[PDB]
Design a protein around this nucleic acid. Structure first.
Ligand code: MG
Ligand code: MG
Ligand code: MG
Ligand code: MG
Ligand code: MG
Ligand code: MG
Ligand code: MG
Ligand code: MG
Ligand code: MG
Ligand code: MG
Ligand code: MG
Ligand code: MG
Ligand code: MG
Ligand code: MG
Ligand code: MG
Ligand code: MG
Ligand code: MG
Ligand code: MG
Ligand code: MG
Ligand code: MG
Ligand code: MG
Ligand code: MG
Ligand code: MG
Ligand code: MG
Ligand code: MG
Ligand code: MG
Ligand code: MG
Ligand code: MG
Ligand code: MG
Ligand code: MG
Ligand code: MG
Ligand code: MG
Ligand code: MG
Ligand code: MG
Ligand code: MG
Ligand code: MG
Lengths: 260, 132, 143, 178, 56
RNA sequence: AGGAUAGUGGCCUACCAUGGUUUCAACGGGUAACGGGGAAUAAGGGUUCGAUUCCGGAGAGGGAGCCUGAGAAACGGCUACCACAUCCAAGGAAGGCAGCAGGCGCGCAAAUUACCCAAUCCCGACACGGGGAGGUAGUGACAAUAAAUAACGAUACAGGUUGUAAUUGGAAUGAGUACAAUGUAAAUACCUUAACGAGGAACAAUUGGAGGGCAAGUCUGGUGCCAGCAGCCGCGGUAAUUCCAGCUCCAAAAGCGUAUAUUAAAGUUGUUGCAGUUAAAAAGCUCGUAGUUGAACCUUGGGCUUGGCUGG
């Protein structure tokens, strides 16, 4: 109606932010950025609701205006900056590096990483095509454009971004046996290997994935993110739980043993 | 009478140059402990300046004898004056309550100025000429 | 075969037949025709205010023998004239001509109640004061 | 605006208002447990009616069904925890056999009287309402507070109550102070 | 019909004041009162139980 | 084929064909019709509702046309007409609360012309400004939660070792009031807590009923087919269990009654699941298109090996 919306009602916010109903009428509307609104995590939610470094929205803006917060190696001062999957958040004042990887419960885990691993990131190749003057380029899942890619790189592959020069270190071809995390749907956060890719021309390709516990699930190819060259060899540290989904009875049994 | 203070969920927050924690106050035979007295006690416990300590949001449990709140300890008084909300500094006497007209008067003055283009001095000078 | 279709593809016949036959249900018919909206003196409302035109005594039906003391009221919202019973021993003296009275039904939902012929409403308040409060001397009529 | 806050009714009235068999049973049950009104009996029957409904739905499922095993064990565990269900009756068939007197046994008012802290069940309620009884180290003044099994041993007078080592009350201080 | 007799009986009913009596207990105390009155000191007339026996 | 559009398209134009929808309900009419997530009631199947906290749409008195701009056919933007309506020195000028609060009117029907950006978020050139968005308090028996209005002894009696019925005590406590602290942007309130705060503990529980349905009087006085009650059946004509009252009792209780709608009861809308000889209801009788529904029949049995889960 007459133009873009600028507000986000609290009840209409993405459920994986885990916002409470009664704290207010509105929720942080993520800015335009590398990641989609529904699949992002604004830095205000991360710094206040997750880390609890800031006590309110006024304080998170004070934190970011002092140049502390870096996303993917660059300083961001937008409190609603849409950080997303595989993004690296650096707070060098606290000497902490985080990577936004989904946990098996469907939410963005608070996953601390080492400084050496915080020097790169993975991006799923969305498309490969030729730019002006006939220069090929790759578009990753976070909107990055890398020119002069390896001519073997195709869509659905994963590239390793140097994240300081923005170049591609190396890549993983999409094929059977590759390690995968699911980035959408009800199997979000699960980790397994590709068993069989089922093609449907004109529709949505489906990928069969086998868990480390030999559980098999099917998901759309658009929700498949290659994260490793084979089983047990991920290119990034996985969050606690290793993307293995436990039944509710198993979780109840595990919690009983953990607490005695 | 033997006020006991416990701190839990302590987080070191160099982003805002402070340490932040939940405060548990055990005050048997005592209605509660005033914020001013808690700041004095907390300053002695952690050997910090009293003006670098901020406490707020206290509530006494049902039946009394215990209160819970939130506390902040800054690395310096200068850091506290930089990151603390204005209303808390007025509570602690570190700042003066800014004096402004009521919200109705500020809005009414703003709408009166919307009817003037240019400086106020010109507008009143022109009005004087018109009425003279 | 019970006189109704049973085939797996006969849902249209079953649905239309029920729709045709619910018109024999007067509760359903009155709801969709909007008879309360068109014909009811209250226009579908639970209550309605009006002005007292005259105090009239109505003879009860047999085998009862009494003078049911009602009033003639012209409704403000639509100008219609109705007869409203004034309940309790001596509450007619609380109701005067050209007073504003709040009316309500007898609870029989548009039908006359008891031996009172042709009366379907009762007086609830007069001059903004509850008739029950006046009867029990809790309040006084503002005049 | 802000999201609505949920609320729900915690009781339901009988369909037939006047029934001597039900009226006598309720009054007999209220007199034994010192209840204020019939709504406190309706509340127990209402919450027991939905415990049975949950158990009935699980009992229609096949045995070894994941939902029946998970929610059935959880429902049994909660009832065992508050002492309503015995430790030797964890079968989800004994849940249906529960009765309203089982729940009224576990009220704070009933437990105060049965622990000897009060002369009668009616003395128990006023002791609770007047902030004399504490469960653990927390004063509870709600008579309907359902006592858990682990809370049973920690019911005693509040430490600052006249009956539990506190100072003399308002009346005594005015009398001995004159 | 004539309206002259409205309020005839109520007007001529001889006024009788309510006798002053102790308040009855309220709330839980009243349920206690009813419970004993009906299940503790039973006043049954050998299988004849009446809430409001008229004097006879 | 063109024009126009950001672009597809009878979107429009020129020329040319005569097509397109429909008893599987088109077209027209009504809607006390914004749609949905949902709500009420519900054994199951259902019935009713959804203006209204979220999503989508539409509108800014009624139409229409536009400027600017990435984005508006925007109305706290403009232009015109219609209807209302304001100031005027009579020449002219200025309007749009279905934003917040408030007023009139309408009605059965609905609150303060309050405080604040502290929170939630949004906007801006922005760490700083603004926000009747929003939050806070006021009014608020819409609904919902918990929950006081008394408890315990001694005598005296009755009574079957203890439940009361009375007149005698000392305890307990919060309703309320308040230093104070907390709370908060500042307050209010809550939560804590000095001092005060209960014998008729007047710190006094009400609303409906007492023939049946339906729990609880054949008590006393009044009236006398009157007055009145009574959802229904009925009561009232001189000992009225029903009216008006007193006493007593019953039901629910900080709530209880009445009116209207709706749901269950209703297997009285029946798919589950009604009825059609006589209670309402088999067309006077055949034909017949759509619709509904339509006989049987086509790899069965046998053998061998093996995986898992139930009982042991
Ligand atoms: Mg849209
Ligand atoms: Mg922004
Ligand atoms: Mg495609
Ligand atoms: Mg200016
Ligand atoms: Mg007919
Ligand atoms: Mg009759
Ligand atoms: Mg064309
Ligand atoms: Mg064409
Ligand atoms: Mg043409
Ligand atoms: Mg509708
Ligand atoms: Mg409409
Ligand atoms: Mg709607
Ligand atoms: Mg409407
Ligand atoms: Mg809306
Ligand atoms: Mg208007
Ligand atoms: Mg207009
Ligand atoms: Mg317009
Ligand atoms: Mg406006
Ligand atoms: Mg607007
Ligand atoms: Mg205005
Ligand atoms: Mg209430
Ligand atoms: Mg009182
Ligand atoms: Mg009464
Ligand atoms: Mg009566
Ligand atoms: Mg009587
Ligand atoms: Mg009876
Ligand atoms: Mg009645
Ligand atoms: Mg008869
Ligand atoms: Mg007589
Ligand atoms: Mg008599
Ligand atoms: Mg019905
Ligand atoms: Mg029938
Ligand atoms: Mg006949
Ligand atoms: Mg017949
Ligand atoms: Mg025939
Ligand atoms: Mg066949």
């Amino acid at each position: 109606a007459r133009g873009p919306k600028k507000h986000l009602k609290r009840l209409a916010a993405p459920s994986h932010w885990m916002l409470d109903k009664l704290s207010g009428t509105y929720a942080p509307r993520p800015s335009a950025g590398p990641h989609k609104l529904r699949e992002s995590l604004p830095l205000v939610v991360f710094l206040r609701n997750r880390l609890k470094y800031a006590l309110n929205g006024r304080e998170v803006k004070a934190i970011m205006m002092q140049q502390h917060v870096q996303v993917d190696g660059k300083v961001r001062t937008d409190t609603t900056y849409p950080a997303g999957f595989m993004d690296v958040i650096t707070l060098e004042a606290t000497n902490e590096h985080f990577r936004l990887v989904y946990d098996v419960k469907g939410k963005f885990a608070v996953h601390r990483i080492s400084a050496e691993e915080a020097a790169y990131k993975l991006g799923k190749v969305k498309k490969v095509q030729l730019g002006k003057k006939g220069v090929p380029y790759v578009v990753t899942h976070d909107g990055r454009t890398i020119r002069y890619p390896d001519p073997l790189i195709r869509a659905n592959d994963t590239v390793k971004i140097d994240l300081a020069t923005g170049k591609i270190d190396d890549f993983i071809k999409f094929d059977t046996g590759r390690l995968v995390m699911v980035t959408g749907g009800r199997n979000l956060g699960r980790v397994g290997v590709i068993v069989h890719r089922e093609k449907h021309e004109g529709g949505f390709d489906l990928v069969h994935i086998k868990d480390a516990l030999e559980n098999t699930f099917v998901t759309r190819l658009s929700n498949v993110f290659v994260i490793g060259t084979e089983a047990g060899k991920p290119w990034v540290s996985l969050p606690k739980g290793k993307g293995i989904k436990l039944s509710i009875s198993e979780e109840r049994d595990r919690r009983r043993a953990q607490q005695g | 009478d033997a006020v006991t203070i416990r701190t839990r969920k302590v987080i070191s927050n160099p982003l805002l140059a402070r340490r932040q924690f939940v405060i548990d106050v055990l005050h048997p035979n005592r209605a509660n402990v005033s914020k001013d007295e808690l700041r004095e006690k907390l300053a002695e416990i952690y050997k910090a300046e009293k003006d670098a300590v901020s406490v707020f949001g206290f509530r006494t449990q049902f039946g009394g004898g215990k209160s819970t709140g939130f506390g902040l300890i800054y690395q310096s008084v200068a850091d506290a004056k930089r990151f603390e909300p204005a209303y808390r500094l007025v509570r602690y006497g570190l700042a003066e309550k800014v004096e402004k007209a009521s919200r109705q008067q500020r809005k009414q003055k703003k709408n009166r100025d919307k009817k003037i283009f240019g400086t106020q001095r010109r507008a009143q000078k022109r009005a004087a000429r018109r009425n003279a | 075969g019970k006189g109704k279709p049973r085939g797996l593809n006969s849902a249209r016949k079953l649905r239309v037949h029920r729709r045709n036959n619910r018109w024999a249900d007067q509760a359903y018919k009155a709801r969709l025709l909007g008879t309360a909206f068109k014909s009811s003196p209250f226009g579908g409302s639970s209550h309605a205010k009006g002005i007292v035109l005259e105090k009239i005594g109505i003879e009860s039906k047999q085998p009862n023998s009494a003078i049911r003391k009602c009033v003639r009221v012209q409704l403000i919202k639509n100008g219609k004239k109705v007869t409203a019973f004034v309940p309790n021993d001596g509450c007619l003296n609380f109701v005067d001509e050209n007073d504003e009275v709040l009316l309500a039904g007898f609870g029989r939902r548009g039908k006359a109640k008891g031996d009172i012929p042709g009366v379907r409403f009762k007086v609830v308040k007069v001059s903004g004061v509850s008739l029950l409060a006046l009867w029990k001397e809790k309040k006084e009529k503002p005049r | 605006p802000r999201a609505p806050r949920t609320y729900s009714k915690t009781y339901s009235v009988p369909k037939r208002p006047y029934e001597s068999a039900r009226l006598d049973a309720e009054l007999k049950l209220a007199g034994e447990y010192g209840l204020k009104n019939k709504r406190e009996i309706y509340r127990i029957g209402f919450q027991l009616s939905k415990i049975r409904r949950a158990a009935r739905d699980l009992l229609t499922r096949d045995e070894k069904d994941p939902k029946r095993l998970f929610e059935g064990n959880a429902l049994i565990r909660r009832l065992v925890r508050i002492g309503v269900l015995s430790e030797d009756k964890m079968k989800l068939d004994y849940v249906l056999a529960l009765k309203p007197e089982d729940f009224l046994e576990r009220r704070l008012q009933t437990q105060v009287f049965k622990l000897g802290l009060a002369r009668s069940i009616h003395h128990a309620r006023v002791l609770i309402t007047q902030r004399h009884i504490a469960v653990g180290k927390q004063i509870v003044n709600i008579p309907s507070f359902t006592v858990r099994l682990d809370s049973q041993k920690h019911i005693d007078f509040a430490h600052n109550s006249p009956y539990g080592g506190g100072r003399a009350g308002r009346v005594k201080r005015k009398n001995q102070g004159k | 019909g004539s309206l002259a007799r409205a309020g005839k009986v109520k007007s001529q009913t001889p006024k009788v004041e309510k006798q002053e009596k102790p308040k009855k207990p309220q709330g839980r105390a009243y349920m206690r009162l009813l419970y004993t009155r009906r299940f503790v000191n039973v006043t049954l007339t050998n299988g004849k139980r009446k809430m409001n026996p008229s004097p006879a």
